Amino acid sequence: DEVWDALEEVIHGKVVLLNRAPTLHRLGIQAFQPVLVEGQSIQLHPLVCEAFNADFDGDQMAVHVPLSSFAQAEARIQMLSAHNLLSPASGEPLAKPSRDIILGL
């Protein structure tokens, strides 16, 4: 059980890259700060589902680990999901309330 704590120590502050095919635009890949969870499933934030065109009918995603300090910097600054909220195409917001959120509000 100590190696899991060690793994918690290792990934501290670091981010990973999530990708979904087909990757149509640059938001087909995004950076996320990983939170270790039990189970064999990757957990994705709802708001980014539109940019990935992702849904939960059995879709799969790939994870990548940026190794260098430079790569990590690039991922955390340029590629982070929270830093990309607007469409590079229309300039309109991409990460926005949808479905159930809209319903409730």
Binding site: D5, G13, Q72, R76, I77, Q78, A82
Partner: protein, 94 residues
């Protein structure tokens, strides 16, 4: 979102320059073992272990916070590389 990311983007004409500065500074910190930091003991980033608060292992966080302080100077052709490296190795050995 990373803390003060908008202000960090403010400090640079290009986001990629911010990224380069952060990365290189992180390399400096890693190389010299954090003893060249511009941060104060109470400004040091912390991480919660089972034991308790310890120094944050992540150098990028350090570099970004340091940059946010303003105590760092970045630009082009500020100093020859060899001279910089040697003065750093003199002030903070390995």
């Amino acid at each position: 979102a990373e803390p003060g990311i908008d202000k960090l983007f403010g400090m640079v004409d290009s986001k990629y320059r911010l990224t380069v500065v952060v990365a290189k500074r992180a390399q400096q910190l890693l190389r010299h073992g954090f003893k060249n930091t511009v941060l104060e003991p109470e400004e040091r980033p912390k991480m919660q272990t089972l034991e308790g608060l310890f120094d944050d292992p992540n150098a990028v966080t350090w570099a970004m916070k340091e940059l946010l302080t303003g105590r760092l100077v970045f630009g082009e052709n500020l100093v020859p590389e060899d001279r910089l490296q040697k003065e750093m190795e003199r002030l903070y050995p390995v």
